[PDB]
Amino acid sequence: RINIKLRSLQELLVFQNKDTGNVIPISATDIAGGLADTVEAYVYMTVGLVSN
Amino acid sequence: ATRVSGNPAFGQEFSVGVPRSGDYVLNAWLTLKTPEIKLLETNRLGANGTV
Amino acid sequence: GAGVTSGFIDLATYDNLDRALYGGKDATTYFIKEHYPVGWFTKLPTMATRVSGNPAFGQEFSVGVPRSGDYVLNAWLTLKTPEIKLLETNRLGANGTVRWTKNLMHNAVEHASLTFNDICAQQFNTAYLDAWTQFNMCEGKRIGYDNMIGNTSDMTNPTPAQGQDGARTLPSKNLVLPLPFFFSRDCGLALPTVVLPYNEIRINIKLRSLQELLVFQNKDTGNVIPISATDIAGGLADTVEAYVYMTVGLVSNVERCAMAGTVRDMVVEQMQAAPTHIVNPQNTNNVHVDMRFSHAVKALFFMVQNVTYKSVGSNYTCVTPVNGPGNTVMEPAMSVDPIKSASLTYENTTRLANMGVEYYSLVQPWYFSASIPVYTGYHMYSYALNVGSVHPSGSTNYGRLTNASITVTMSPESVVAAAGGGNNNSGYNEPQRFALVVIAVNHNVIRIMNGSMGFPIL
Amino acid sequence: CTTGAGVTSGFIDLATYDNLDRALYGGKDATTYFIKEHYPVGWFTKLPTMATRVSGNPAFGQEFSVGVPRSGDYVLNAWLTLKTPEIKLLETNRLGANGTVRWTKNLMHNAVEHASLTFNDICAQQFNTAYLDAWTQFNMCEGKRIGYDNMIGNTSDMTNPTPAQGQDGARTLPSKNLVLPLPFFFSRDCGLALPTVVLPYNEIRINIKLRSLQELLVFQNKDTGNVIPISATDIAGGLADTVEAYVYMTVGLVSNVERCAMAGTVRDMVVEQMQAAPTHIVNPQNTNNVHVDMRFSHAVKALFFMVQNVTYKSVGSNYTCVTPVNGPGNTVMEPAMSVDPIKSASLTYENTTRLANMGVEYYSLVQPWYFSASIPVYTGYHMYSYALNVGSVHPSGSTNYGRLTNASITVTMSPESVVAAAGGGNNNSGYNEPQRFALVVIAVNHNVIRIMNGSMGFPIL
Amino acid sequence: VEYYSLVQPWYFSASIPVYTGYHMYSYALNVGSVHPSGSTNYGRLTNASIT
Amino acid sequence: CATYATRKDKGWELNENRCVWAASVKPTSGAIMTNVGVHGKSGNAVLMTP
C-alpha cells in the first residue's frame, strides 16, 4: 500500500501584502467560491508483463 | 491503482493499494487537479493584498 | 479502465524477427540487476602541505602533496578576492569605472604545473582552461561553474565613482577553481602514494599581477588604461590568501599489502601550447604557423585573441566589450570571430581543405564532444571519436610525423577593425592587435616501479 | 582555515564494519576502483570528405541527388551545408508600409522534406520535417541545444521580422551558411557503419528534395497579423531559384588486419527506420474526436503524434492552435492564447482499448520524463513509447505490427482549438482568420539489413 | 490524373476515352484480351486503399 | 518471397502463442473435511496448502 497525506489549503496559498510585505493566513471569505476541501486526484503506476 | 481507503481531500491521509495480476511494478506517479482561485475585494488585506 | 489483461497481444505477437532479437535460453533480462562486491575504502578532504613561501599576486609558489594517504584523486584551489572601492581622484575623473575582468578565474593563474620531484609532468594555462571548460562542460553544473569562478554578474558589473549614482563596491568573496589533472580525469587513475615513498610531488601555481586583473573603462569613449594604487581606496594588496585542498582516499589493509611491491602502467593525457603568433591583418589575409608536437596528439584547439589591453582577458573576439545601460558590460553590434577559414598541411599535403569557420565552431563539437561553446571563437579539431573519453581512441603521433602547418584566412570584419576610426563605445575606437594561439592534447604512458616513476619512452 | 582532521580521521570509518558491509563490499573476487583495466583497440583514422554530386546543379524547389564516395572503409557521419540568400524588403510591396518579412521558424528541418537514402535503386531510408522536429525535440542532448539552435536557424536574427526600407527597421536578413546533420542508421551509433569496401556492387545514393522559397518566407501583416504569399517583385534582387548546397560525409580507414578478414562473410545488422501514416484533416467545429487507423510492418518502438496548424504554407513547425503574430520591438511573440489543440488521446487494438482516454499532459510530460533523454520545450510533441529507452541503439521492448491487426488512435480535441477554428478574433490575436488543422502520426521501427556477396538486401522485407 | 487518363489507355487498352473522368489502372498488358495476363489476387492480399 | 501483407495469418496469434503468459489467482488454503463424523458426533479438517 501507498499512504499519502495532503495538507490543508491554508498552508498552500500565500496572501502577501502589496506594499509592507506582510503575510497573513488565508480565510474562506477571502476568495470567491469557498475552499473546496475535496480534490480530484489519482495515483497511476506502470506494470511489466514477462514470459511464462 | 486500486483505491482501498480514504477520499482524496486536502488535509487528510488516504491509502491506495498496489494492483495485482502483474509481474513487475517499476513506476509510480500521482496526478491531481488544482482548484480555481478568485480573489475578492472584501478580503482582510483590502486592496493591498495579493493571493 | 484497461487492466493488466488488456495486453497479452504484445506477447502473442512473436515472429522470426522477434526470435532473432529477443528470446533465447542465454538471453539476458531486465528487472534483475547482477550485484557484485566492490572494494572497501573511504575518502576525506585534506589541505595541501605548504612547503614553499606564501601566496601573493604576480609571484609563483609551489605546494607539496601530503603523504600518508593511500590514494589522492582530486585537487582544487581556493582564493578570496580583495575589496575594491572607487575614488574621485581617478585619472579618468567622473567618466571612469572599474570592474573585474570576465572569467576572473582561468585568469590570475598562469603556467600551472605538476612536477614529480622537479621533473615536469604536465602544465596548463588560461587558453587550455577556457577551451576545456567551453568544450567539455556537463550541463546542470554550468551555472555552478559560472558561479564558483567569478562570472556572477556581480564582479563584472561596472561600478561608477562615489559621487555618481552607482556607489556599490565589489564584494570580497572566496572563489574555488578545480585543477584538471590526470588523476582528476578519472577515478581509476590516482597517484599511488603508498607505492611511491621516494618521489615527492609538487604543484607550481603562478598568480598574475593585479594591474591587468582589473578593467578600468571610460564609459564615454570606451578606452582602457592600466590602474594604479591611488585610483582605488586602501591600496593594491600584493599579498593574497589562497589554499589548495585535495581529496585523499584510504584502502583496506588486506589488499594494500597485496598490491604493495608490484609494477603498474598508466596512461595519461598532457597539454602542449605553441607560442603565440602575432597576426597583422593589415599586411595580408593569410597566416601560416608551424606546429611542433611530440607524442600521439588527440585534439587541437586554435583561437585568435584580441590582445590590445592586458586588463581585459578571455576576449577571443575582434572587438572588445564596452559599457552599456544599467551599469553593465555588453559586446558591440559588430562582433564576429576574426578567423574566416582554416586548413591543415601535412608537409605539402593538405589534410583539410579551406573549410569554413562554422564547421570547426559547430559541426566538430556537435559530433566529437559533450558540449558546444556558447561564445565566439573556440575552434577545435579532434582526431578521436570522443575528446572527453579517458580511454584512447584514434589518434596520430607527431614524433614520427614531419613538420605540419596550420593556415588561417582572416575576415573583412577583422581587417577593418584592425584600424581605428570607431565611434564612441564602438569597441574598435583604437587600433587592435591579435594573437593566434594553438594548443594540443595528446597521450602518454606512466610506469610505476621500485617506489619510483618515470616515462618508459621519455 | 584550520583543518585539524588529518588523514587519521578516516581510520574509524575504515574500521567500522558489519554483516551489511561484508555482504556489500569485501571479497577476494571483488573489483576495486583506483585501478582502470586497459585493453587495446583497433588502429584507424577519420577525416571529412566531399560527396560527389551526380545530378545537375542543386536549386530551390527541386530535387538533387548525390552519391556516396568509395575508397573509405566506413562512412559514419553526413551533413548538409547551404548558404541562404540575402533578403531585403522593398517599399513597393503589396502590403505597403504595414508589412514585414521574416524567415520561418526552424528554417532548417524545413526546406528539406522526404530526404531519402537508397542502395542501388532500392529505397532504404527516408525522413521528413515532422520526424526531424520530433526527434530533435525528444532526444536532444542538453548542452548542444544552443549550438543546434544557432546552426539550424532560429538564431534570434533570421527569425526577427524586418519592416520595409522606408520604415524604422531597414535591417536586411543576413546571408550566412547553415548546416543540418542527416540522421541515418549508420549515423545513429559508431558501431553501425556502412561497409563501403564490402559493398562495391551497389550505388549508395542520397536524394534530397528542397522546398520552394515562396513558402519558406513569412510575409506578415504589421497590424492585423495576416499572412499572404511572397512574390518576386516584393523583395529586392528577386528570388534566386539556384542555390549552392553541399553534402559532406566522414570516412574511416582501417588496417588490413581486419578490413580484409571481415570481407567474404555474411553480416547482419539491426537498423531503425521510419513509417509515416497519411495526414488527416481535422475540423473541430464539426467533430469533437478523430480516429486514425495506423498500419505498420515491423517492430514499432515509438509513436509521435502532433496536430499542425496548416492555415498558411509559409509558416512551418506550428503545432499550436493559434498562429504566431508580430509583436512590439520588431520581434515575434506567441499570442496570449496558445495551447496544444489535443485535449486527450487513446489507443485501441481490435475493439479493446489498451490505453484509456488519458490526459494530454500524460504523453506531453510523463512519458518523456521516463522513457526519453529530454522533454520538449514547445507545446505539442506527444509521444508514446513501447521501449524503456527510446534513444538506445540496442533493442528494447517492442511490439511487432506485422502480426498485429488494425489499430486505431483516437484524439479528442480541445475547446480552445474548437473556438480558435472559428475566426472573429481582433488584430494580432492569431486566430483572426479561420484556422485549419491536420493530424500527423510518425512511428519508429527496427529492421534487419544483411550484407552478402558485395550486396545488401532485406532478408525479411 | 492525366497519367491514368491518357498514358495507361495508350499502352494497355484499345481506345482512349473522349470524355472527362474514367481513370484506369490495369495490372495486365491487355485489358480487352480474354487470355489471362499479369494480375494479382486480393483474397490473399490484406485490404488496400485508394487515395 | 513471403511478406507480412500477403500472409494467411492474422487473427490467430493468440492461438499460436497462447502459452506466452498465464493468469495468477489469489492464493487459497485447501481446507477439506476428512470425515463427516459418526451419527453427527466426530469430525476433523485438514489444511492441504496452509
From TrEMBL, chain A:
<protein>
    <recommendedName>
        <fullName>Major capsid protein</fullName>
    </recommendedName>
</protein>
<comment type="similarity">
    <text>Belongs to the NCLDV major capsid protein family.</text>
</comment>
UniProtKB/TrEMBL annotation, chain E:
<comment type="similarity">
    <text>Belongs to the NCLDV major capsid protein family.</text>
</comment>
<protein>
    <recommendedName>
        <fullName>Major capsid protein</fullName>
    </recommendedName>
</protein>
Automatic annotation (TrEMBL), chain F:
<protein>
    <submittedName>
        <fullName>Uncharacterized protein</fullName>
    </submittedName>
</protein>
